[PDB]
UniProtKB/Swiss-Prot annotation, chain A:
Intrachain S-S bonds: none
HAT repeat locations: 8-40, 42-69
Subunit description: Identified in the spliceosome C complex. Present in a spliceosome complex assembled in vitro containing CRNKL1, HPRP8BP and SNRPB2. Component of the minor spliceosome, which splices U12-type introns. Isoform 2 seems to be predominant in the spliceosome complex. Interacts with PPIL2 (via the PPIase cyclophilin-type domain); they may form a trimeric complex with HSP90.
Highest taxon above the source species: Eukaryota
Subcellular location, record wording: Nucleus; Nucleus speckle
Recorded family membership: Belongs to the crooked-neck family.
Function: Involved in pre-mRNA splicing process. As a component of the minor spliceosome, involved in the splicing of U12-type introns in pre-mRNAs.
Organism: Homo sapiens
Name of the protein this chain belongs to: Crooked neck-like protein 1
Swiss-Prot record, chain B:
Residue window of the full protein shown: 196 to 244 of 536
S-S pairs: none
Name of the protein: SNW domain-containing protein 1
Similarity section: Belongs to the SNW family.
Summary of the function given for this chain in its UniProt record: Involved in pre-mRNA splicing as component of the spliceosome. As a component of the minor spliceosome, involved in the splicing of U12-type introns in pre-mRNAs. Required for the specific splicing of CDKN1A pre-mRNA; the function probably involves the recruitment of U2AF2 to the mRNA. May recruit PPIL1 to the spliceosome. May be involved in cyclin-D1/CCND1 mRNA stability through the SNARP complex which associates with both the 3'end of the CCND1 gene and its mRNA. Involved in transcriptional regulation. (Microbial infection) Is recruited by HIV-1 Tat to Tat:P-TEFb:TAR RNA complexes and is involved in Tat transcription by recruitment of MYC, MEN1 and TRRAP to the HIV promoter.
Superkingdom field: Eukaryota
Location relative to the cell: Nucleus
Segments forming a coiled coil: none
Cross-link (Glycyl lysine isopeptide (Lys-Gly) (interchain with G-Cter in SUMO2)): K45
Stretches the record annotates as Disordered: 14-38
Residue list for modification Phosphoserine: S29, S37, S39
Lineage, opening ranks: Eukaryota, Metazoa, Chordata, Craniata, Vertebrata
UniProtKB/Swiss-Prot annotation, chain C:
UniProt note on tissues of expression: Widely expressed.
Function: Plays a role in pre-mRNA splicing as core component of precatalytic, catalytic and postcatalytic spliceosomal complexes, both of the predominant U2-type spliceosome and the minor U12-type spliceosome. Functions as a scaffold that mediates the ordered assembly of spliceosomal proteins and snRNAs. Required for the assembly of the U4/U6-U5 tri-snRNP complex, a building block of the spliceosome. Functions as a scaffold that positions spliceosomal U2, U5 and U6 snRNAs at splice sites on pre-mRNA substrates, so that splicing can occur. Interacts with both the 5' and the 3' splice site.
Domain notes: The MPN (JAB/Mov34) domain mediates interaction with TSSC4 and SNRNP200. Has structural similarity with deubiquitinating enzymes, but lacks the residues that would bind the catalytic metal ion.
Protein name as annotated: Pre-mRNA-processing-splicing factor 8
Shown chain mapped onto the complete sequence: 613 to 668 of 2335
Compartments where located: Nucleus; Nucleus speckle
UniProtKB/Swiss-Prot annotation, chain F:
Function: Required for pre-mRNA splicing as component of the activated spliceosome. Plays an important role in embryonic brain development; this function does not require proline isomerization.
Organism: Homo sapiens
Disease per record: Pontocerebellar hypoplasia 15: A form of pontocerebellar hypoplasia, a disorder characterized by structural defects of the pons and cerebellum, evident upon brain imaging. PCH15 is a severe autosomal recessive form characterized by progressive microcephaly, and poor or absent psychomotor development with severely impaired intellectual development apparent from birth. Other features may include spastic quadriplegia, early-onset seizures, and chronic anemia and thrombocytopenia.
Quaternary assembly: Component of the pre-catalytic and catalytic spliceosome complexes. Component of the postcatalytic spliceosome P complex. Interacts with PPIL1; this interaction leads to CDC40 isomerization.
Domain of life: Eukaryota
Whole-protein residues included: 83 to 220 of 579
Name recorded for this polypeptide: Pre-mRNA-processing factor 17
Post-translational modification: Undergoes isomerization of the peptide bond between Gly-12 and Pro-13. The reaction is catalyzed by PPIL1.
Location in the cell: Nucleus; Nucleus speckle
Intrachain S-S bonds: none
Amino acid sequence: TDEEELNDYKLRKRKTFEDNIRKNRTVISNWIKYAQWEESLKEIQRARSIYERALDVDYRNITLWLKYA
Amino acid sequence: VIRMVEMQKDPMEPPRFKINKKIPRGPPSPPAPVMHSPSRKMTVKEQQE
Amino acid sequence: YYRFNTGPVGKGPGCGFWAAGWRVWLFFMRGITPLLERWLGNLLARQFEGRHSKGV
Amino acid sequence: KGEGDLSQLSKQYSSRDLPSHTKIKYRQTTQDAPEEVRNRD
Amino acid sequence: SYQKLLKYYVLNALKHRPPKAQKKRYLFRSFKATKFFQSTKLDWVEVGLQVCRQGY
Amino acid sequence: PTYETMFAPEFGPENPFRTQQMAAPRNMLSGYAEPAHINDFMFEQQRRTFATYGYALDPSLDNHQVSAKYIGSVEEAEKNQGLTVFETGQKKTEKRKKFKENDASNIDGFLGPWAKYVDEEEQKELDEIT
Ligand SMILES: O=P(O)(O)O[C@H]1[C@H](OP(=O)(O)O)[C@H](OP(=O)(O)O)[C@H](OP(=O)(O)O)[C@@H](OP(=O)(O)O)[C@H]1OP(=O)(O)O
């Protein structure tokens, strides 16, 4: 049950961090730490959409744009 | 050419479909360029003030 | 009831002049029909399509 | 084309939202109506 | 009872405002044009037992 | 307005980069639709004509600019010589005689318009399916 524990760990972390960004839609540390956690997986086609919907609530900050760039 | 009439809605009906959905707000209108004044930084001491 | 009892008629029941209470409890429903009509319409809305928690 | 809950999506015939005062009183000529505003000093 | 019906009759005669409604409707003629409502001539007790049956 | 302005064709190779469906004119993603005010009676008459015998005339304005033909099942139009459903035909063929009882006096014998007509191995497979 290695795949079960792997998907369980990833699903718990994704659910906790999606509840975190659902609770606070202002501070931008949560989206960038979640998206760099997916960047640690090194093969993603979904983290670009995360940075794309993370700049809709705040496009005036430099940190999110420079980190995604 | 075809014929288009309307079915009569009887006035003995509650609202049929559950209007209780809640989604997060989507992407808004796309951001215009921001075009402020040239941003300045004061000193090392007035920031300490 | 105190106009049946005038004369040698009797104290017991038999008071069957009913139109006066009938008119005022028609006057009740005459004004309450749109009120609890709207209330039961709101009840059918709250039951069948659900409530609105943070809408209005 | 898909408005809010106030338009069509609700049968909540709510209290305080009724056709009360369905006519607008207009300021007539003896008060400070804009026809007498456009010329007074 | 005399003086309290005098009170209620004076309170009804004092607030006798004119019926300033602009349009008029009936709500029975609008039901009858619909295919789901039909007109028939029945007995009284059938109508009463029918509406209490439907209310239950 | 001038007929020459709308009659002037478009200079080009028809642009075959698109397919036959997408290069076709439309306003809805499925066909150019527009309301009109056609009479009801002849509409429903030719509708019932095509529903019964399977032939009707062809409604359009600018397909070929000359059109007076029949559509659907072709041979049954000239077989019946173009009759309608509201017209008494030239013959009364294959007619079907019912029985009537319209005295309204007898019990369990009155059969007027509610009358039944004078005329009035698969189970093993259906058991094996279910
Ligand atoms: O007790 P009283 O003040 O003297 O009035 C009563 C009383 O009427 P009210 O209480 O409404 O004033 C009775 O009604 P109940 O409330 O006791 O049911 C009524 O009898 P009805 O129900 O037939 O109307 C009749 O009393 P009675 O049974 O003797 O007819 C009547 O007046 P009297 O007691 O003076 O007759």
